[PDB]
Amino acid sequence: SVIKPDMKIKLRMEGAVNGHPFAIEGVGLGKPFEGKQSMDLKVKEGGPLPFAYDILTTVFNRVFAKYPENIVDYFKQSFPEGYSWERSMNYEDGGICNATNDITLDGDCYIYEIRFDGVNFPANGPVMQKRTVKWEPSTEKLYVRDGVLKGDVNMALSLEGGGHYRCDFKTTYKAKKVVQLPDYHFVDHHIEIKSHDKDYSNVNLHEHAEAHSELPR
């Protein structure tokens, strides 16, 4: 099919946090069937970013998730046409980020058109104070609602000096064409910034994801 063992990624994010605009572009590669991917991101506008880079990472494609044969793969089925997703990320201190990604395919390269908008982040919260360390691994819960796929996940950012900062993700996935809808399942994730420069102008990001149909896994 159109899904190859090794594929590329090209993306551009345009957004704002607390009213301050910025733009980031990236290029990467991954293995859809292995659920692994990596990419290099460069801040193009609005740098240096005055907020924690981690709030952006999960926005920078579930096609990069290892799906077992007994689970319907909504994402790999959506191509060559592609799909799009919308997401609201509700942080425990009131900060709220809304994001969207329109994913298309050009040859062996996925193209992302991303929008990101966060508001109400407290001035002295971990996000505006850049006190986040990394996102903890997680388990996303996927279920069908009104012909489309939903995905919810309890996320947590490890904090500098100890503790965690919670955020609840609510994502809606929409294939561009009619595809087979999956039954209730899970997707394990682990996103990590492997390297970055001082002000995060350059970031190397990695993600590993695998789906499973029953728990305990």
From TrEMBL:
InterPro entries: GFP, GFP-related, Green_fluorescent_prot. Pfam families: GFP (PF01353). The keyword Metal-binding applies. Cu(2+) 1 binds at residue 196. Cu(2+) 2 binds at residues 206, 208. GO terms for molecular function: identical protein binding; metal ion binding. Keywords: Chromophore, Luminescence, Metal-binding, Photoprotein. Belongs to the GFP family. This is Fluorescent protein Dronpa. It comes from Echinophyllia sp. SC22.
